[PDB]
C-alpha cells in the first residue's frame, strides 16, 4: 500500500517535522485528535501513505527522536501533539551538545537500537514500504550525528528501501554554534553514500526570503519553518493526493538522479507567503533564484533534471506554454545531454490559503556553491585545529576530519565535472 515511514531527529528535525504533520494533517482533513473531518474523499485516497488507521483514527507513521527531552516535550503539548503515537517518542536525557561525535558515536549509539525497534515495528505493519524520510539539521549534534547514524543502520536493515532527507544546512547568518561547519561536513559524506534524495534547505536562503521578500525585519525559526513545511507539503503532494502522477519514491528518484552521488536537490516554492497569481507569475517565480531555498545561483551552474508540481485549478495548456518560455529564457542553464529533463505535474487540490501554488525540485550543479561554502568555513577552523577538542574528547581522530574534508572536495569536483561536460 506504498507506505512511507517518517523520522525526525533533534531540535530542528522535530520542529520542522511537527510543522510538516500540522500542514498535511490539515490538507487531509485530520484534526489534532486524529479524527477525519473533511469534505472530499480525495483527502483519504492516499491517506495510508503517511497515516496508519487505528476508532476510525489516523495516526502519523512518524518516529520522534532526540537526545534531550526538551523539544519533544514541546511537541507533545503543541497543537497536533496528541496525534503522534506515544510509543514513537524515543528520547534520551544527556543531549548532544551540538556535537556530531556525541550524536554519531557516544550518546547516540546508546539510543539508536531503541529507535530502530520502533522503526521495525512501523515497517512490519506496512503492506509495501516505499521507504523513509528524515527531517534534521546538519549543524547540530543529534539530527546531524545521530540522524546519519540512523540512516546507516536503516540501510543495513533495509538496503532495498528508498531513503530521502530534508536536511537543513547551517549558515553563519543563522547560527547557534561555531562548530556547525564541522558537523555539516561530517554529515554530508554520510548523505552522499546513504540517501537517494536530499533536499538542501539552507537557513541563509530561508532568512533572506523572510527578510527581503516577506518583509520580516526579525525572522524567527518559526518563520523559517513555515517555508520548510510548505515546501515539504508540495514535494510530497504527488505521493499524498490523486492526480497525474502515481509514482513511488523509487520511480521519482530514478527520473531525477542521473548519478548516485549527485542527489542533492535545490527546492523552491511559489507564491512566497489576496491577488491570485497568474500562471506566468507562478512559473517565473519558481525559477527565480530568490524563490530557491539552497542559497545557490542556478545561473552559476546547470540543471541535470528539474521537476515541478503545480497545485490548484488552472489551465495546463497555459503552464506548458510558460514552462517553454522560462526554459528558453534559461536555455544555457540546462544540460543538453539529458533530453526532456524538465518535467511538470498537476494536482487539483491546492494548499490551505492558496488558490494555486507551485513547488520546484531542481537537481542543479550550482549546489556545489553550498558545499564549497561549508568546506571553506570548515577549513578556516581546521587549519588551526580550532574547537577539535570537543570531538577528540569523544574518541574521534584528526584523520576522520581530514577524510571528511577530502570527501567534500571530491563531491564539489564531481559537480564541476558535469557543469563543464
Amino acid at each position: 500500500m506504498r507506505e512511507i515511514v517518517h523520522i525526525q531527529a533533534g531540535q530542528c528535525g522535530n520542529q520542522i517535522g511537527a510543522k510538516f504533520w500540522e500542514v498535511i494533517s490539515d490538507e487531509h482533513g485530520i484534526d489534532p485528535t486524529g479524527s477525519y473531518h473533511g469534505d472530499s474523499d480525495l483527502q483519504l485516497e492516499r491517506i495510508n501513505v503517511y497515516y496508519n488507521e487505528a476508532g476510525n483514527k489516523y495516526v502519523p507513521r512518524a518516529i520522534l527522536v532526540d537526545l534531550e527531552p526538551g523539544t519533544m516535550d514541546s511537541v507533545r503539548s503543541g497543537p497536533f501533539g496528541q496525534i503522534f503515537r506515544p510509543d514513537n517518542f524515543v528520547f534520551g536525557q544527556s543531549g548532544a551538545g551540538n556535537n556530531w561525535a556525541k550524536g554519531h558515536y557516544t550518546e547516540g549509539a546508546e539510543l539508536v537500537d531503541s529507535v530502530l525497534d520502533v522503526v521495525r515495528k512501523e515497517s512490519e505493519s506496512c503492506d509495501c514500504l516505499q521507504g523513509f524520510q528524515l527531517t534534521h539539521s546538519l549543524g547540530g549534534g543529534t539530527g546531524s550525528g545521530m540522524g546519519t547514524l540512523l540512516i546507516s543502520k536503516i540501510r543495513e536493515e533495509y538496503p532495498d528501501r528508498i531513503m530521502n532527507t530534508f536536511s537543513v544546512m547551517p549558515s553563519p547568518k543563522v547560527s547557534d554554534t561555531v562548530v556547525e561547519p564541522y558537523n555539516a561536513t561530517l554529515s554530508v559524506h554520510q548523505l552522499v553514500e546513504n540517501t537517494d534524495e536530499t533536499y538542501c534547505i539552507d537557513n541563509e536562503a530561508l532568512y533572506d526570503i523572510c527578510f527581503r521578500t516577506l518583509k520580516l525585519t526579525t525572522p524567527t525559526y518559526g518563520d523559517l519553518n513555515h517555508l520548510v513545511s510548505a515546501t515539504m507539503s508540495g514535494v510530497t503532494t504527488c505521493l499524498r493526493f490523486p492526480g497525474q502522477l502515481n509514482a513511488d519514491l523509487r520511480k521519482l528518484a530514478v527520473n531525477m538522479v542521473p548519478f548516485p552521488r549527485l542527489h542533492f536537490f535545490m527546492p523552491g516554492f511559489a507564491p512566497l507567503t489576496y491577488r491570485a497569481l497568474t500562471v506566468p507569475e507562478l512559473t517565473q517565480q519558481m525559477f527565480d533564484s530568490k524563490n530557491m531555498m539552497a542559497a545557490c545561483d542556478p545561473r552559476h551552474g546547470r540543471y541535470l533534471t528539474v521537476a515541478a508540481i503545480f497545485r490548484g485549478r488552472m489551465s495546463m495548456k497555459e503552464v506548458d506554454e510558460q514552462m517553454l518560455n522560462v526554459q528558453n529564457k534559461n536555455s544555457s542553464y540546462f544540460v543538453e545531454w539529458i533530453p526532456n529533463n524538465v518535467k511538470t505535474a498537476v494536482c487539483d487540490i491546492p494548499p490551505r490559503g492558496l488558490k494555486m501554488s507551485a513547488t520546484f525540485i531542481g537537481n542543479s550543479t550550482a549546489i556545489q556553491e553550498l558545499f564549497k561554502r561549508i568546506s571553506e568555513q570548515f577549513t578556516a577552523m581546521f587549519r588551526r585545529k580550532a574547537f577539535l577538542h570537543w570531538y577528540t574528547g569523544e574518541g574521534m581522530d584528526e584523520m576522520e576530519f581530514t577524510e571528511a574534508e577530502s570527501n567534500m572536495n571530491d563531491l564539489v569536483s564531481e559537480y564541476q565535472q558535469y557543469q563543464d561536460a
Binding site: A101, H104, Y105, T106, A109, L149, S152, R155, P159, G395
Partner: protein, 61 residues
C-alpha cells in the same frame, strides 16, 4: 491495373490491386537471469561489508 483474388462474403470483401510487377533455450535464459541475480547479491554483500567496516570503526571510537 488488375484486380485479383476477389473474395466476397456477407460481411465484406477483399482483393489485391497490382499496379506493376517487381532462439535462446530455457537453460540459457535461466543462466542469464541467474547471472544477474548473483551480480545483485555480490553488490549487496559489498554494501553490507562496507557497512560492517563502519560498525567496527564506531566501536573503536
Amino acid at each position: 491495373m488488375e484486380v485479383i483474388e476477389l473474395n466476397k462474403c456477407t460481411s465484406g470483401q477483399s482483393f489485391e490491386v497490382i499496379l506493376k510487377p517487381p532462439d535462446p533455450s530455457l537453460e540459457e535464459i535461466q543462466k542469464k537471469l541467474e547471472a544477474a541475480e548473483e551480480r545483485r547479491k555480490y553488490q549487496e554483500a559489498e554494501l553490507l561489508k562496507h557497512l560492517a567496516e563502519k560498525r567496527e570503526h564506531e566501536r573503536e571510537v
